[PDB]
Amino acid sequence: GDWHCDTKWMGDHVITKSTRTWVLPTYGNHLYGPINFDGTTGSGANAAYAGYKTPWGYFDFNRFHCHFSPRDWQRLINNHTGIRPKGLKIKVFNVQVKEVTTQDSTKTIANNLTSTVQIFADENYDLPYVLGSATQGTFPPFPNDVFMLPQYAYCTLQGNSGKFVDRSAFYCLEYFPSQMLRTGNNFEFQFKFEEVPFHSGWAQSQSLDRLMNPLLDQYLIGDYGTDASGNLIYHRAGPNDLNEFYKNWAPAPYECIQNINSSDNTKNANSINGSNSTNKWGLQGRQAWDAPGFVQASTYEGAAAGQSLLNGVLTFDKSSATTSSPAATAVNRTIEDEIQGTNNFGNARNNIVAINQQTKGTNPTTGSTSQFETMPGMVWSNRDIYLQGPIWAKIPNTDGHFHPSPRMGGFGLKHPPPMILIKNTPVPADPPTTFNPMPQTSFITEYSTGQVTVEMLWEVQKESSKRWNPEVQFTSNFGTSDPAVDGIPFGINNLGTYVESRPIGTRYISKHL
Amino acid sequence: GDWHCDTKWMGDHVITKSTRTWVLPTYGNHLYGPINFDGTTGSGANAAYAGYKTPWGYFDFNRFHCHFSPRDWQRLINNHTGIRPKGLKIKVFNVQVKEVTTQDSTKTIANNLTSTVQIFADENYDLPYVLGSATQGTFPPFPNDVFMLPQYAYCTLQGNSGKFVDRSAFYCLEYFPSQMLRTGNNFEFQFKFEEVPFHSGWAQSQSLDRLMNPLLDQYLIGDYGTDASGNLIYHRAGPNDLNEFYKNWAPAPYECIQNINSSDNTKNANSINGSNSTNKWGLQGRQAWDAPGFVQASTYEGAAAGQSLLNGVLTFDKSSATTSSPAATAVNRTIEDEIQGTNNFGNARNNIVAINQQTKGTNPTTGSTSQFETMPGMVWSNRDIYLQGPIWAKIPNTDGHFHPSPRMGGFGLKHPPPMILIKNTPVPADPPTTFNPMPQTSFITEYSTGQVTVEMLWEVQKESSKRWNPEVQFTSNFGTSDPAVDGIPFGINNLGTYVESRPIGTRYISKHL
């Protein structure tokens, strides 16, 4: 049982290892409970839910900075055009259970060598899978930090006002087999990923309307209009008009999403209510935000500085925080312009279709559309992956799905890495000396802690490009930093806190279409 | 896991062993932090730095009295003309972790058998190497003393006012693999030194201008001058002038260093400002002391008593001390006169060169020089090694270096003994019973302690000299010592403190050139 936290680059694959220290409290006083919300004191009826919270807790490693340091991430993105996960192994070890006693003001903490902790992996996916929702409680990016394991809870099928119905499910986690760990015992688990395509780690150096040889003319003839008598006129497209070429392929579908400018406030309207202006989808008589949505270009070359989309991009914290309304200086806002070749700007809404039927006496009319959905012959790119973003998501179990790439990013999986759940075994306090049939509610106060190591095998694609001129690379560029106030970017500041200075995607090397 | 501390003399090699007891605190509250200094409150802009301090700590055995008792050192220097290191092995064992609780005034200390400590050697030289700077924190010379391990920190590349720049490096030490030690576990490491030349353990019994047979004349003819008409005059050198012999070899190069007299204050000027009078070299727009410098003779035979060089020699404490301005009676000041055969006196500045071009009508002129650097045909000796001095230094990793013998003394190495770093594994206190995403800052107060044994294999050269008369030997000479006040020299005094009475070099046996 030793420490690791290291990376090994072998050819076409790479292995990451990392070790952390976790702490597990007793949750819920060893009790289950039902939880609801009817919505009133909150947002409203769209916010209602019903479910259960459990005494158990769980591990979540599903972000990239869990497995990669910033320098390792740089080594990846400048030299490689693709990555996918292959295998996984987890080890929980060096477990300690501690008892807490409080007399008067003082508080003493003692070690208990015989008390245990329970752990199991859910290999058959029997529990509601709450990973892949991008919530808090993941391993910290900086290896020296100690973190709490979050409490496990789930939502089930609801009726009106967040009430249970006939199909609502209650799960007992003690009904699973688990193994019991003392000091000296360890838990191990291995997993193999299913086959998935490489994530595309390059930026597009062509656009989908320019794929032609610009010097030539087509052998296809286009319809230029009618003359004053109504005879059809023909025209051949060529170098003076490249936009009129007949083409084999069309760009990505869209639902129109509203623009927003993050840098410059003169471009925005005053007092926008974000919730009223976001895209939404309905289900069971209520509405939910559609965000980030299916990825669109958030900006393009020639657009104004700071151009973005309203709830169309991902935004991260610079450091772990609880704030409900963080300041603009505290966040990293992503920008996806690398897809601008196949993916239109999200607020453009500039596709045109014919809205009537023309005859002599009635002129043809057209209109722009806010909705243009999938048609045969369209191509598109997925959203990028980030050092701060999620790795995988579980594909819902359903009869049908279209292009099951998760919208926030990463790898869609039929069988994701299973949840690993853990809790302290309850230790009763002193019973009465007369028999009582009731369940015993008095327990010894305790918590546990240990180490966990995660090892991942990744497969990568090296970059072969034959362009003559140099390419854009990710580099560290800042003028100067004050060690008194600030410290080194991607480092520890003056207060001992780890700071992630800016967001980092994977798309730097370029390819033609 | 047993005690050793002993020496074994085998022929042409010798093995030293020693065992000590160490104590390791928690440093920095388990935090990294950036450190700078802009210079103002201190010396000034020449004093600025930028860097990081870490929660870790490390072992430093790099002084000779770590491995040799004074009697063993005597046995070495009277009988041997050379020594070099061969091999090394280190063992850390009998580790105890202790928890500290404070209630009201009293303080209780308890043992924790399951808590660990982390240790690794840096074999690939990935960390900044801070050994070889002759700082405090080495193993104590007397085997019964208990010592703290120092906190690890480093300097990185700086700009103005001690600010970080783009190439400044932050290192995470948890990113290294390390092994975790409980009570009952031990750490072992072995190392082999690269081939180096023997240190020269003899004093010179000849001088470089006297190498001739004094009875004879040369067959080479010298130029004695011109006559009144300007005709060249010739002269043959012989026993009446030995200084005028044509010679094959020249003495050592020098940068002139100022003299100082340590014994007699009538020789010194009043109110010398040492910092203004020392030799300095510039780098990156600031200046640093050049000390001790390239070794010169600090005194020679016939010079006044107490003659020395200003920051030209090494000076040690008699006992371990924190004093910033120690008294003259508290120090051991070294004297290097054993090199006076090949190495000129440091303040002499008596070499002479021609400063003009002579013709009829203009007389030849010469001048003395303060700077005379390396020329083909020069020979020199290195600085001596001392029982109190450093053993090795790391040669900087650079394209070029000239005669890479470290200036303070010892053995220059491309691959020195690697740093061994250690820290207490953080143990969190009781968490709250509601999940919080923040890192946990509350820890159990603890420290660790153990034993460490170091074993070194040395290679030595025995002395063959055929001179008829006896030689100078190092001996113990003092009239009497008061056991009430003082005790035995190189022993424990009345207060229980170990005292090193005088400095001891290696050069006693003599050889001709």
Side-chain angles (χ1 to χ4, degrees):
Chain A
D2 288 344
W3 188 273
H4 297 289
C5 293
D6 55 346
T7 301
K8 182 180 173 62
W9 293 91
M10 297 170 66
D12 58 351
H13 59 85
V14 61
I15 293 170
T16 57
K17 291 178 179 179
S18 59
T19 298
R20 302 288 188 270
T21 296
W22 54 268
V23 62
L24 175 63
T26 296
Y27 287 116
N29 294 127
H30 304 288
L31 274 41
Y32 290 82
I35 52 176
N36 63 30
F37 181 67
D38 63 11
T40 300
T41 193
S43 298
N46 286 334
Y49 66 89
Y52 279 91
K53 57 185 176 181
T54 67
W56 291 79
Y58 65 98
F59 293 94
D60 188 3
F61 49 92
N62 191 22
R63 300 176 70 184
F64 281 101
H65 57 247
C66 299
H67 311 285
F68 291 93
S69 68
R71 178 68 182 91
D72 281 336
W73 186 258
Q74 196 185 16
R75 184 173 294 106
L76 171 68
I77 61 175
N78 288 147
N79 300 123
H80 301 85
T81 54
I83 184 169
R84 58 182 180 188
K86 301 302 288 187
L88 174 63
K89 60 185 66 179
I90 299 166
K91 183 170 180 285
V92 177
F93 59 100
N94 292 338
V95 177
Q96 299 175 346
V97 179
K98 292 184 179 298
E99 295 179 352
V100 180
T101 300
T102 299
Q103 61 178 18
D104 291 341
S105 64
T106 189
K107 182 186 291 180
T108 183
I109 294 172
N111 199 35
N112 187 335
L113 276 65
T114 187
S115 179
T116 60
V117 77
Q118 295 178 338
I119 181 167
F120 71 96
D122 182 10
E123 294 179 350
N124 294 333
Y125 300 113
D126 287 333
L127 294 172
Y129 188 83
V130 298
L131 274 58
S133 296
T135 56
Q136 288 175 328
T138 56
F139 299 182
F142 184 73
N144 195 33
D145 288 343
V146 176
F147 66 102
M148 294 179 70
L149 300 176
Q151 187 180 357
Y152 177 75
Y154 64 91
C155 298
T156 192
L157 184 64
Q158 65 178 18
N160 285 337
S161 296
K163 293 177 178 178
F164 297 121
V165 294
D166 279 336
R167 296 185 182 279
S168 296
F170 172 74
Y171 300 94
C172 178
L173 274 63
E174 290 77 2
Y175 181 77
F176 295 79
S178 63
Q179 76 177 29
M180 303 180 79
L181 272 64
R182 293 177 181 82
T183 301
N185 294 335
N186 61 41
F187 174 83
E188 292 178 351
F189 177 77
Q190 292 179 336
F191 177 81
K192 185 171 179 288
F193 288 90
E194 65 191 343
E195 182 67 18
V196 298
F198 288 93
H199 181 273
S200 62
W202 64 90
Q204 300 166 336
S205 63
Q206 280 178 323
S207 69
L208 192 67
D209 55 346
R210 293 293 180 266
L211 298 177
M212 64 204 81
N213 183 336
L215 291 176
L216 297 176
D217 293 342
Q218 286 184 322
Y219 58 81
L220 293 174
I221 309 301
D223 295 340
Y224 179 83
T226 59
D227 62 355
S229 178
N231 294 125
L232 178 64
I233 298 170
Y234 292 100
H235 186 273
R236 190 192 302 273
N240 292 131
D241 49 349
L242 293 179
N243 53 335
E244 302 182 354
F245 280 58
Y246 282 64
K247 288 179 287 292
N248 279 326
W249 305 111
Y254 62 84
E255 301 300 328
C256 182
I257 175 171
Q258 183 61 260
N259 73 43
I260 194 69
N261 191 329
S262 62
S263 295
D264 184 4
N265 61 34
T266 60
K267 300 292 185 290
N268 297 133
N270 292 335
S271 295
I272 294 170
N273 186 335
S275 179
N276 293 135
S277 297
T278 56
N279 290 346
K280 295 173 180 174
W281 50 258
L283 189 70
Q284 284 183 332
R286 61 187 181 276
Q287 289 174 329
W289 290 10
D290 179 66
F294 170 69
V295 62
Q296 301 298 110
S298 62
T299 188
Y300 61 92
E301 291 169 348
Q307 184 65 63
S308 179
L309 297 173
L310 178 71
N311 290 126
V313 294
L314 300 180
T315 301
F316 302 100
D317 288 337
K318 290 180 179 294
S319 297
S320 63
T322 60
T323 59
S324 64
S325 297
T329 57
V331 298
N332 292 136
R333 188 176 182 85
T334 59
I335 295 168
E336 187 64 17
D337 55 351
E338 295 85 357
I339 60 170
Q340 70 188 26
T342 57
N343 285 267
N344 193 24
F345 174 67
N347 200 38
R349 65 181 301 278
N350 51 345
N351 298 159
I352 304 300
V353 298
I355 57 173
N356 71 346
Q357 296 176 334
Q358 71 175 26
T359 59
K360 187 173 295 297
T362 180
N363 293 337
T365 59
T366 59
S368 62
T369 60
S370 293
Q371 286 177 318
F372 197 89
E373 289 88 356
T374 303
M375 293 294 287
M378 290 179 178
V379 300
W380 62 90
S381 180
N382 291 336
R383 189 181 298 278
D384 201 6
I385 55 169
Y386 296 90
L387 177 63
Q388 283 170 324
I391 301 167
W392 64 82
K394 183 172 180 289
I395 296 168
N397 188 30
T398 58
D399 289 339
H401 50 73
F402 175 69
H403 195 267
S405 180
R407 283 189 174 178
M408 294 187 284
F411 301 93
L413 302 175
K414 301 298 184 182
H415 299 90
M419 294 181 69
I420 296 171
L421 281 79
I422 184 170
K423 73 178 187 74
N424 303 140
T425 301
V427 180
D430 56 344
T433 55
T434 301
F435 172 77
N436 184 337
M438 299 300 291
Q440 300 298 102
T441 60
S442 294
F443 297 95
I444 295 168
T445 302
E446 69 188 347
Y447 70 94
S448 63
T449 186
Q451 278 88 16
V452 60
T453 179
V454 55
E455 178 178 359
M456 293 187 72
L457 174 62
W458 300 92
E459 183 176 1
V460 292
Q461 293 182 335
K462 287 178 177 176
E463 173 273 341
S464 60
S465 64
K466 287 190 73 76
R467 60 185 279 166
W468 179 263
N469 55 333
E471 289 182 350
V472 303
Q473 305 300 324
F474 177 80
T475 186
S476 66
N477 194 32
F478 61 90
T480 299
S481 178
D482 185 4
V485 176
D486 184 67
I488 293 174
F490 295 96
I492 301 300
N493 65 25
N494 190 35
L495 270 61
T497 299
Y498 181 73
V499 180
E500 288 172 342
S501 296
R502 49 174 177 172
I504 305 168
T506 56
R507 297 194 173 105
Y508 288 86
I509 299 164
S510 297
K511 293 179 179 178
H512 62 268
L513 270 301
Chain B
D2 288 344
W3 188 273
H4 297 289
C5 293
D6 55 346
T7 301
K8 182 180 173 62
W9 293 91
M10 297 170 66
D12 58 351
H13 59 85
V14 61
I15 293 170
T16 57
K17 291 178 179 179
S18 59
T19 298
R20 302 288 188 270
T21 296
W22 54 268
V23 62
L24 175 63
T26 296
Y27 287 116
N29 294 127
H30 304 288
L31 274 41
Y32 290 82
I35 53 176
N36 63 30
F37 181 67
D38 63 11
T40 300
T41 193
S43 298
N46 286 334
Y49 66 89
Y52 279 91
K53 57 185 176 181
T54 67
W56 291 79
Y58 65 98
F59 293 94
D60 188 2
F61 49 92
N62 190 22
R63 300 176 70 184
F64 281 101
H65 57 247
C66 299
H67 311 285
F68 291 93
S69 68
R71 178 68 182 91
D72 281 336
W73 186 258
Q74 196 185 16
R75 184 173 294 106
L76 171 68
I77 61 175
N78 288 147
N79 300 123
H80 301 85
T81 54
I83 184 169
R84 58 182 180 188
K86 301 302 288 187
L88 174 63
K89 60 185 66 179
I90 299 166
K91 183 170 179 285
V92 177
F93 59 100
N94 292 338
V95 177
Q96 299 175 346
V97 179
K98 292 184 179 298
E99 295 179 352
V100 180
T101 300
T102 299
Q103 61 178 18
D104 291 341
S105 64
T106 189
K107 182 186 291 180
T108 183
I109 294 172
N111 199 35
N112 187 335
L113 276 65
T114 187
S115 179
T116 60
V117 77
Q118 295 178 338
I119 181 167
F120 71 96
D122 182 10
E123 294 179 350
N124 294 333
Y125 300 113
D126 287 333
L127 294 172
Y129 188 83
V130 298
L131 274 58
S133 296
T135 56
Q136 288 175 328
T138 56
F139 299 182
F142 184 73
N144 195 33
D145 288 343
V146 176
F147 66 102
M148 294 179 70
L149 300 176
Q151 187 180 357
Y152 177 75
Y154 64 91
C155 298
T156 192
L157 184 65
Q158 65 178 18
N160 285 336
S161 296
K163 293 177 178 178
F164 297 121
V165 294
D166 279 336
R167 296 185 182 279
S168 296
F170 172 74
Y171 300 94
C172 178
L173 274 63
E174 290 77 2
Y175 181 77
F176 295 79
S178 63
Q179 75 178 29
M180 303 180 79
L181 272 65
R182 293 177 181 82
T183 301
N185 294 335
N186 61 41
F187 174 83
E188 292 178 351
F189 177 77
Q190 291 179 336
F191 177 81
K192 185 171 179 288
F193 288 90
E194 65 191 343
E195 182 67 18
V196 298
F198 288 93
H199 181 273
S200 62
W202 64 90
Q204 300 166 336
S205 63
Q206 280 178 323
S207 69
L208 192 67
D209 55 346
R210 293 293 180 266
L211 298 177
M212 64 204 81
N213 183 336
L215 291 176
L216 297 176
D217 293 342
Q218 286 184 322
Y219 59 81
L220 293 174
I221 309 301
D223 295 340
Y224 179 83
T226 59
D227 62 355
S229 178
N231 294 125
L232 178 64
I233 298 170
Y234 292 101
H235 186 273
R236 190 192 302 273
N240 292 131
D241 49 349
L242 293 179
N243 53 335
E244 302 182 354
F245 280 58
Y246 282 64
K247 288 179 287 292
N248 279 326
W249 305 111
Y254 62 84
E255 301 300 328
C256 182
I257 175 171
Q258 183 61 260
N259 73 43
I260 194 69
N261 190 329
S262 62
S263 295
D264 184 4
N265 61 34
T266 60
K267 300 292 185 290
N268 297 133
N270 292 335
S271 295
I272 294 170
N273 186 335
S275 179
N276 293 135
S277 297
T278 56
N279 290 346
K280 295 173 180 174
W281 50 258
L283 189 70
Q284 284 183 332
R286 61 187 181 276
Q287 289 174 329
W289 290 10
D290 179 66
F294 170 70
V295 62
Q296 301 298 110
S298 62
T299 188
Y300 61 92
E301 291 169 348
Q307 184 65 63
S308 179
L309 297 173
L310 178 71
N311 290 126
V313 294
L314 300 180
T315 301
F316 301 100
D317 288 337
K318 290 180 179 294
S319 297
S320 63
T322 60
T323 59
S324 64
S325 297
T329 57
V331 298
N332 291 136
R333 188 176 182 85
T334 59
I335 295 168
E336 187 64 17
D337 55 351
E338 295 85 357
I339 60 170
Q340 70 188 26
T342 58
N343 285 267
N344 193 24
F345 174 67
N347 200 38
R349 65 181 301 278
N350 51 345
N351 298 159
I352 304 300
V353 298
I355 57 173
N356 71 346
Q357 296 176 334
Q358 71 175 26
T359 59
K360 187 173 295 297
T362 179
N363 293 337
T365 59
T366 59
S368 62
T369 60
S370 293
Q371 286 177 318
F372 197 89
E373 289 88 356
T374 303
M375 293 294 287
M378 290 179 178
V379 300
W380 62 90
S381 180
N382 291 336
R383 189 181 298 278
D384 201 6
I385 55 169
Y386 296 90
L387 177 63
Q388 283 170 324
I391 301 167
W392 64 82
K394 183 172 180 289
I395 296 168
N397 188 30
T398 58
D399 289 339
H401 50 73
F402 175 69
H403 195 267
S405 179
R407 283 189 174 178
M408 294 186 284
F411 301 93
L413 302 175
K414 301 298 184 182
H415 299 90
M419 294 181 69
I420 296 170
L421 281 79
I422 184 170
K423 73 178 187 74
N424 303 140
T425 301
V427 180
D430 56 344
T433 55
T434 301
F435 172 77
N436 184 337
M438 299 300 291
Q440 300 298 102
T441 60
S442 293
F443 297 95
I444 295 168
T445 302
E446 69 188 347
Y447 70 94
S448 63
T449 185
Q451 278 88 16
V452 60
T453 179
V454 55
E455 178 178 359
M456 293 187 72
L457 174 62
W458 300 93
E459 183 176 1
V460 292
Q461 293 182 335
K462 287 178 177 176
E463 173 273 341
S464 60
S465 64
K466 287 190 73 76
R467 60 185 279 166
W468 179 263
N469 55 333
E471 289 182 350
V472 303
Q473 305 300 323
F474 177 80
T475 186
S476 66
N477 194 32
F478 61 90
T480 299
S481 178
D482 185 4
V485 176
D486 184 67
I488 293 174
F490 295 96
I492 301 300
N493 65 25
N494 190 35
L495 270 61
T497 299
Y498 181 73
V499 180
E500 288 172 342
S501 296
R502 49 174 177 172
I504 306 168
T506 56
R507 297 194 173 105
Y508 288 86
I509 299 164
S510 297
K511 293 179 179 178
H512 62 268
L513 270 301

